[PDB]
Write an enzyme that holds these catalytic residues in place. Structure first.
Site, PDB file in Angstrom:
ATOM      1  CG  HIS A   1      16.958  22.352 -37.582  1.00 39.18           C
ATOM      2  ND1 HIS A   1      16.551  23.388 -38.395  1.00 39.18           N
ATOM      3  CD2 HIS A   1      16.859  21.227 -38.328  1.00 39.18           C
ATOM      4  CE1 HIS A   1      16.235  22.912 -39.586  1.00 39.18           C
ATOM      5  NE2 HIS A   1      16.414  21.603 -39.573  1.00 39.18           N
TER       6      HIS A   1
ATOM      7  N   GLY B   1      14.884  15.694 -45.852  1.00 40.82           N
ATOM      8  CA  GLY B   1      16.294  15.794 -46.160  1.00 40.82           C
ATOM      9  C   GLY B   1      16.674  16.916 -47.097  1.00 40.82           C
TER      10      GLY B   1
ATOM     11  CB  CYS C   1      16.798  20.856 -43.665  1.00 50.30           C
ATOM     12  SG  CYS C   1      15.091  20.834 -43.098  1.00 50.30           S
TER      13      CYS C   1
HETATM   14 SE   LIG Z   1      15.506  20.089 -40.899  1.00 48.62          SE
END
Ligand SMILES: [Se]
EC number: 3.4.19.12
Length: 299
Positions: free
Chosen positions: A39, A141, A143
């Site tokens: 994503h 932030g 991820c």
């Molecule tokens: Se994300």
């Protein structure tokens, strides 16, 4: 007795920054491949209902900005494997440690190197909840931050963070892209399901308490496997199997307490509570140490 995480040096040297369009998140650079959540190719509007196959076709190799400290990496190949992106790059990571990819099971623990824009910021230990979530610290932030275990010189990568559920808990995938649990990388309401307590872990923790002086909870009673399991369901405890009794073998031998006798202390603990006192300085039952974690922190 402390929750203690693996040394993170071997993973720090693998942490890169991946930017596609306006979205920027963390990646894992092993050999000549960078792994990141898929994503990253999503705008904030795409997350409501993304068609990832369609969205990935809008993108080419030059749309991806992979940064490892000050060095950019030239992306020369892109591939979607489940929910992770695989950015083939021209430069192999000189710091690539010896690594495996493993899918762990609920109740097993691992360390997490929380990163923000490709730079490590913190390390902590956690467990995969029975409902396949983890409770942790994943600010905006984080991820792409990964979970791992370390055997000898081998880094077993097991987790990549993708989503914070609307209930505040976190969910993610293995390094092949398959989510743990029934979660999907989509900004929609998702049910986590009833969580339970990792019973084999609590017993392992009580063994650590006996080894470190705390013994007030040691009881005169004993009980059977079926009787204890009957008390377990009531209190939302994982059912205890003979595999769990076997794994607690070495701990039962070093303290001279049968597993079933420890289950009877837990039974009276579940039915009576702490009643004011603590075990290893905790006012509640800790279930994020596996029997392997306890043995590693003893002898
Ligand atoms: Se994300």
């Amino acid at each position: 007795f402390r929750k203690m995480a693996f040394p993170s040096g071997k993973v720090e040297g693998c942490m890169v920054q991946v930017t596609c369009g306006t979205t920027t998140l963390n990646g894992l650079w092993l050999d000549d491949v960078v792994y990141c959540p898929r994503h990253v190719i999503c705008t904030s509007e795409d997350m409501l209902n993304p068609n990832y196959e369609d969205l990935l076709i809008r993108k080419s190799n030059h749309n991806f900005l992979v940064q490892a400290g000050n060095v950019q990496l030239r992306v020369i190949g892109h591939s979607m494997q489940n929910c992770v992106l695989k950015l083939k790059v021209d430069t192999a990571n000189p710091k690539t440690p010896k690594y495996k990819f493993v899918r762990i099971q609920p109740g097993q623990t691992f360390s997490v190197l929380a990163c923000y824009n490709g730079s490590p910021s913190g390390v902590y230990q956690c467990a995969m909840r029975p409902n396949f979530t983890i409770k942790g610290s994943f600010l905006n932030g984080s991820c792409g931050s990964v979970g791992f275990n370390i055997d000898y010189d081998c880094v077993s990568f097991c987790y990549m963070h993708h989503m914070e559920l609307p209930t505040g808990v976190h969910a993610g995938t293995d390094l092949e892209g398959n989510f743990y649990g029934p979660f999907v990388d989509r900004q929609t309401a998702q049910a986590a399901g009833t969580d339970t307590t990792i019973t084999v872990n609590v017993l392992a923790w009580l063994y650590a308490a006996v080894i470190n002086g705390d013994r007030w909870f040691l009881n005169r009673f004993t009980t059977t496997l079926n009787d204890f399991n009957l008390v377990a369901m009531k209190y939302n405890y994982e059912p205890l199997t003979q595999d769990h009794v076997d794994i607690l073998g070495p701990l039962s031998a070093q303290t001279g307490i049968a597993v079933l006798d420890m289950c009877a202390s837990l039974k009276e603990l579940l039915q009576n509570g702490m009643n004011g006192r603590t075990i290893l300085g905790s006012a509640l039952l800790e279930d994020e140490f596996t029997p392997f974690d306890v043995v590693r922190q003893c002898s």
